[PDB]
Design a protein around this nucleic acid. Structure first.
Lengths: 283, 124, 116, 124, 283, 124
DNA sequence: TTATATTAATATTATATTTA
RNA sequence: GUUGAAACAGGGUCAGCUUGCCGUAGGUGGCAUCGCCCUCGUC
């Protein structure tokens, strides 16, 4: 398990693409209404991490609660077929299953899992807790109408002289989402989330956008990963007073942002040196 | 059960979304994911998010409407609704949160009551 | 404003239970405590679940029927109230059970829909 | 339901696009793809993209208007709108995103209310 | 025990997350409906203070009356397996059990606990009474529809291979909840709640959100803890004539808030010094 | 709604074209194809293309102006505009693309506001 | 416990400001 | 003015004590704005 409480600002941009498809209630880049600032759900980045770990580790003790063929209760009832077949006395049987799928699933060690679903296998608090990535400046979603030279369904509206299905490719022309995340040692005690699991998580935040590429999401990158490694299990300083260190603003005169060169990521590690380590992993 | 002059921004946006989906569902009635199925979640809560895109998306439905006068019928009540919408609110108030669903189903009733829109248009 | 929202909750949960036959958390088990007593807290969000439930109805005509009756229910509603008086949370419960045994009537919704 | 002096660049551009399509749809009423059907998607979002071309395209509609004074009627309110448009914004703000659709349908109502433009012009 | 009575205003905010989901309302944050202002139950902050004390103290005399496998009657019956097994004469057996449960469990010593349940351990009121936390401004609960590329029990698995259970993630795009609280001395005498336990509680209030992070909370912080320490065991001033000194308003020209930088927290310590201290513990 | 000192080359060229067509449409008001109808498409996009020819064409309109002092009125504001035009840009920038239409209709308003040009000239 | 299949769907408006 | 009278529900008693809505989950995967159209005819 880890022994230092990391609180990290993970700045990631989208150069031209749909960062987090969008609310599913809508599909134009997930925005904060009032500010127009784009949102990227914590679960979206958690999925980028999950996909990165799934492609990279391809290992036991690092499985994921996988993609489409991902009936989770299958993977949970699989946990009830180990040393805790039944001899673990339902009270602590769910705890033993929880420990098993912490150990097995890097997903669950890193981010929690509501595993209280199948043969109930406890709930994991997920040491690593990314928050809703909200873009520094209002994402100016472009909503590019695209076409298809091919209709999908043989519907009534797949007409004679052309089969087209216009469709729309929502895209953020650029948006530097900011993902405050918290890695809690107290909840890494409950999963065995290790310093190596956490190095995998940092490697994931840095490199997970270079691999989870898509037509929808365009080009999207980890512009910065400024972790604050507290000296102790507790908080060496209130998390937000640390995230204010990583102050991201538009540059001097850019009215609108087009690239990371339109964003002063001012970072002051002046007094966190008290007991925090500002590990600028991603930039 | 439709206050066409309610002025409650949630209610007028619900009405607006109801007519928007009415047009989409008359543009191509065979439709997997109407804007209720894909946009309503935020149209009810974040009208600025969708309702901009809902009206990128609207003139094309009005085109796809088979009965070209039916397009005028529905566009007219979109305008009737939007007189009451001085702005798509950033986030719908909670009162307005519910009144959006109220508006969706009030205006959806008004559209699926047989002669109502074709009548009420002819008094304009 | 309590009885018609009870009916609204009944149709909403019927649509959900019609969309997902086997549910572990119906919008009853998940939203009832506050849809009964605090309709704006919930019915503004039950009815975002609603288009998805109607989409998932395997008989899209059944989705149309259920959406029609929720239009009828909600036609009697001019606004979800901020808080339902103790008078109406009884109505909500009565309205809920009335509408849910109307939905689980033999052909009631199919009929009432067909007379419109 | 039209704030002719709103100054909200999204709203004034929506009004401007509404009158632009009004002219196009009075230039040749029988029109497959009005500028709503072909330009609105970006006029609502990228006003610089179209609204330049929309006004290459505008004097020719004003010519094609059968009633030569109706062309003055509509051009006058284009100018009335464009007093409020110091610039076509590069990308319409999200508030302005929605207010463009607001403007389209507000000004479209104002144009399809019977005497409004012909009246309001005569007070200028 | 403490010899001063405290009335604290604990301003804590949520940036992008569910501060306290209403189980009655899906999981969307508790809200004062007729004013839209958010709510965070007193039990929610008492819970996160419990989690904080369970996190940091890790020692007897500060247990928590505790987490899931926390059958409370088990702890209560532990009280009756003590020096007061028989020697305390069922009448005051429950009172000796109260004194125990107060000694061991900081939850009970600090907040109360209804422990009249098992081998009846009495009924502790609890010197520390947080109120409900009504956000200063209507929280605009975003209700971010999210997706999961996995399902649960192979009963909701798709009729095709494409398993997914989109689900919903309610987030408050910002809410500065304001929790009035009362450290009542008269019940500190009952529980033995001491100034050490009270300093633990102040640390807990300041740091209870740096550690209780979820995919649900997103990011919650403790924007201020203004503690009015009265001179007397009694109240020097009426509690609300104090809480009106901490006037928290949305700043001059914010349509609705999106960060603590949108709220002005004006603290009026001008004349409270009649006999009485205001210590700005958190802000 | 006219920034007479905008200096935005698109906006000053739009103003210049507005006064150019004002002169053409006061030279002979009965005009089939004003320079809006024949030149605007490139004046808005390729100012070097027309605006050279637009001012071959301008002194002759100033001659054809019936009120010989009105010619001075309009030529003066052509000069007022052209102080802000250090060069007719080869291709109008896209921002400037839209600002040309802005200028056309801003200056057209300024010309069709009753006393504005005759006043503003008299403060020179 | 029950129940479990599509309502509605055809055009608003439309005639010239400014010009010493 | 000889005939049912007189008559308390009283007095008073915190529903309290307190309890995370939760753990968490990609909006996705992707889709050409297209195919093309003398600015002309002429003074």
């Amino acid at each position: 398990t880890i022994e230092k409480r990391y609180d990290f600002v993970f700045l990631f941009d989208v150069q031209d693409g749909n960062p987090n498809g969008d609310p599913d209630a809508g599909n134009l880049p997930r925005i904060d209404p009032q500010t127009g600032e784009g949102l990227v759900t914590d679960v979206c980045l958690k999925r980028k991490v999950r996909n990165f770990i799934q492609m990279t580790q391809n290992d036991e003790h690092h499985d994921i609660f996988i993609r489409e063929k991902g009936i989770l209760n299958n993977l949970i009832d699989e946990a009830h077929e180990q040393e805790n077949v039944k001899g673990k006395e339902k009270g602590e049987k769910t705890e033993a299953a929880r420990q098993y799928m912490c150990s097995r699933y890097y997903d669950i060690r890193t981010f929690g899992a509501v595993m209280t679903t199948g043969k109930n296998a406890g709930q994991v608090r997920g040491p690593v807790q990314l928050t809703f990535s909200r873009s520094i400046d209002p994402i100016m979603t472009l909503e590019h109408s695209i076409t298809r030279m091919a209709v999908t369904n043989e519907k009534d509206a797949s007409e004679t002289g052309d089969n087209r299905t216009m469709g729309r490719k929502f895209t953020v022309p650029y948006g530097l989402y900011r993902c405050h995340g918290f890695i809690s040692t107290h909840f890494a005690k409950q999963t065995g989330f290790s310093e190596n699991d956490l190095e995998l998580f940092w490697q994931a935040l840095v490199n997970m956008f270079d691999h989870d590429h898509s037509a929808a999401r365009g080009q999207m990158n980890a512009r910065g990963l400024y972790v604050f490694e507290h000296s102790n299990n507790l908080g060496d300083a209130p998390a937000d007073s640390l995230f204010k260190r990583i102050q991201v603003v538009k540059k001097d005169g850019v009215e609108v942002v087009r690239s990371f060169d339109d964003y002063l990521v001012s970072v002051d590690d002046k007094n966190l040196e008290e007991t925090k380590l500002l590990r600028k992993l991603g930039g | 059960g439709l206050d066409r002059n309610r002025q409650d921004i949630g209610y007028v946006l619900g009405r607006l979304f109801a007519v928007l989906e009415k047009i989409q569902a008359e543009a191509n009635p065979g439709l997997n994911a109407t804007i209720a199925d894909r946009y309503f979640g935020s149209a009810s809560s974040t009208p600025i998010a969708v309702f901009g895109t809902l009206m990128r998306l609207l003139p094309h439905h009005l085109n796809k409407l088979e009965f070209e006068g039916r397009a005028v019928q529905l566009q007219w009540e979109i305008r009737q609704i939007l007189e009451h919408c001085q702005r798509f609110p950033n986030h719908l108030n909670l009162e307005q949160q519910g009144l959006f669903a109220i508006g969706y189903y009030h205006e959806t009733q008004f559209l699926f009551t047989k002669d109502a829109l074709k009548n009420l248009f002819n008094e304009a | 404003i309590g009885y018609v929202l009870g009916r609204l909750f009944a149709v909403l949960e019927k649509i959900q239970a019609e969309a997902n036959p086997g549910l572990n958390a119906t919008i009853a088990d998940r939203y009832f405590g506050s849809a009964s007593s605090t309709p704006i807290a919930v019915f503004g969000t039950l009815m975002r679940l609603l288009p998805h439930h109607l989409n998932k109805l395997e008989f899209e005509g059944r989705a149309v029927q259920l959406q029609w009756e929720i239009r009828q229910i909600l036609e009697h509603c001019q606004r979800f109230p901020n808080h339902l008086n103790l008078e109406q949370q009884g109505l909500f419960a009565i309205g809920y059970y009335h509408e849910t045994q109307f939905l689980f009537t033999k052909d009631a919704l199919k009929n009432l829909f067909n007379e419109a």
